[PDB]
């Protein structure tokens, strides 16, 4: 095992044997590093455990060098140095921050912090541990037998006994057993499976765990600010469509990378298909997590750039439906869309990374190692919905930790920001300007005299933890026999089990908050369900009200967040 130190790149044979992802490390770290923490087992090509028959000493501050093999103060020889002296551990070729990564449990917000705060290296190392950590944690749930069919989209289930049982909603996906991928919604529960299958009594779920590989690539390469357009080469006779966005065209072929932070409805998909048109020979790759975000670039690609040069890669593990309308596979292809986890090894002239709030630091690294890139695009909003990081439960994750993208956004600002909305009825866009944007965001559109605010706490009932607000469902639906007109409107609120309960008595299409970013609809009702930290989460409610183009009716719970909603307030 001969490699790298993870905390000063200084050759060694050393790796840490109580780390989950065993990183190399130096003497002078490795000591700093077990002296420090409860991680004491130490391997090099040989573990550092004593040689005695029967001895279980593997603490390398209780092990000494006897000649050329290991051994505890009960077995060491008379000429015998100790492993762990003088700031080193003995190892071939002859920090604080490492410590907590290395030990925390990722179930506190202060541990994302430091995973964002840290060295290049230590942010490789934290995401690789996360992730590592994330996997580990979907063991722990029970298996789900199958217990009886119902009907198409219908089941009951059976449990495991002593393990705890997972939340069902469409975020955790099981692996049916080989049957295919499945999702659940709330003892009748809707089954969906994403290959379609006669629901086999006795078949189980299971919450399938993919292996973390390593991170090599950095999660952002170092900078390079260039006095011209590197690589790519411009037009003069370009549409005026794209004119207000020339300036910033020019900035992306001047620098290596470049960040974008667009509010919503300012032009994010609009500024990175144009700037196909503008370098209109350079081959670019469109990036992103999701499989939705991915097809909504597909879907601007598809009304400017020609649809030949266009390819949608598919994992060829196919989970949910996407863009049908490009030749698929075709990696050659001028223009690449693809989620990051399905990226191929290949290079590119731009890369344009879209919805940068949803990222990972371990999403940024494995671009920057599929991709080689001229130039990289970071397109997104630090005031939108982060990924959902699965262990954390104790504290709030704030927008400069979502991310190292993120991070500069929020700190540096971002190198380029579209400050017009041109979505949302300007009720909506001076809420949010003044919530999330320090009142750089404008309204291109009037106010329509179409956003509604209801103060109306309910009655807070839970499916488990997921909310149901009755009350606040039976507002919306006297509401909507006075206003027929918002029945061509969507259902929005922060909980799955609020929307379930929404879509049998108003029949509304429902969307929570989390998926509706994106997205956009003329009509929104929103009921905010609970006065939680969840749903008063700013950047949910900045995502939840500029979903409307035309108007929106929000029952609030919390007092805050409806004064600061600059709308027409209602009474009953
Ligand atoms: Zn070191
Ligand atoms: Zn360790
Ligand atoms: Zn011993």
Redesign the pocket.
């Known amino acids: 095992a001969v490699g790298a130190c993870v905390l000063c790149n200084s050759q060694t044979s050393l790796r840490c044997g109580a780390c989950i992802r065993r990183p190399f490390l130096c003497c002078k770290c490795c000591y700093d590093h077990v002296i420090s923490t409860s991680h004491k087992l130490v391997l090099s090509v040989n573990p550092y455990v ?1 040689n ?1 028959p029967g ?1 279980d ?1 593997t603490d390398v501050t209780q092990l000494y060098l006897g000649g050329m093999s290991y ?2 103060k ?2 060491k020889p008379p000429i015998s140095f100790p492993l762990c002296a003088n700031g080193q551990v003995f190892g071939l070729y002859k920090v604080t921050d490492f410590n907590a990564i290395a030990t925390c449990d990722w179930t506190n917000a202060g541990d994302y912090i430091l995973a964002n705060t840290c060295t290049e290296r230590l942010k490789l190392f934290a995401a690789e541990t996360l992730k590592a950590t994330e996997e580990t944690f979907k063991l722990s749930y029970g298996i789900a037998t199958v217990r009886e069919v119902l009907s198409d989209r219908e089941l009951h289930l059976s449990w495991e006994v002593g393990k705890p049982r997972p939340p069902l909603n469409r975020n955790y996906v099981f692996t049916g057993y080989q049957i295919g991928e499945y999702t659940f919604e709330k003892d009748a529960v809707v089954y969906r499976g994403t290959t379609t299958y006669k629901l086999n009594v006795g078949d189980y779920f299971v919450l399938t765990s993919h292996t973390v590989m390593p991170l090599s690539a950095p999660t952002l390469v170092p900078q390079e600010h260039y006095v011209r357009i590197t690589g790519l080469y411009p037009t003069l006779n370009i549409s005026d469509e794209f004119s207000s966005n020339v300036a910033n065209y020019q900035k992306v072929g001047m620098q290596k990378y470049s960040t974008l932070q667009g509010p919503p409805g300012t032009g994010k998909s609009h500024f990175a298909i144009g700037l196909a048109l503008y370098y209109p020979s350079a081959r670019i790759v469109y990036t992103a997590c999701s499989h939705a975000a991915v097809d909504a670039l597909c879907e601007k690609a598809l009304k400017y750039l020609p649809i030949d040069k266009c390819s949608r890669i598919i994992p060829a593990r196919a989970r949910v439906e996407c863009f049908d309308k490009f030749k698929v596979n075709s990696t050659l292809e001028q223009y690449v869309f693809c989620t990051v986890n399905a990226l191929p090894e290949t290079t590119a002239d731009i890369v344009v990374f879209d919805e940068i709030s949803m990222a990972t630091n371990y999403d940024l690294s494995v671009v920057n190692a599929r991709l080689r890139a001229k130039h990289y695009v970071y397109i997104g909003d630090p005031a939108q919905l982060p990924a959902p990081r699965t262990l954390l439960t104790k504290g709030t994750l704030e927008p400069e930790y979502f991310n190292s993208v993120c991070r500069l956004m929020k700190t540096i600002g971002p190198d380029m920001f579209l400050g017009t909305c041109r979505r949302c009825p300007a009720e909506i866009v001076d809420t949010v300007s003044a919530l999330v944007y320090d009142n750089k965001l404008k309204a291109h559109k009037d106010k329509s005299a179409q956003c509604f605010k209801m103060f109306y706490k309910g009655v807070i009932t839970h499916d488990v933890s997921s909310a149901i607000n009755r009350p606040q469902i039976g507002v919306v639906r006297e509401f909507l026999t006075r206003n027929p007109a918002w029945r061509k409107a969507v259902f929005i609120s922060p909980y799955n089990s609020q929307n379930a309960v929404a879509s049998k008595i108003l029949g509304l299409p429902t969307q929570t908050v989390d998926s509706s970013q994106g997205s956009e609809y003329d009509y929104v009702i929103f009921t905010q369900t609970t006065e939680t930290a969840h749903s008063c989460n700013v950047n949910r409610f900045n995502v939840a009200i500029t979903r409307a183009k035309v108007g929106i009716l929000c029952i609030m719970s919390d007092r805050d967040l409806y004064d600061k909603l600059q709308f027409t307030s209602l009474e009953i």
Do not use: D, F, Q, T
Request: charged letters at 0%.
């Open positions: 004593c005695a001895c000493v051994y505890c009960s077995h």
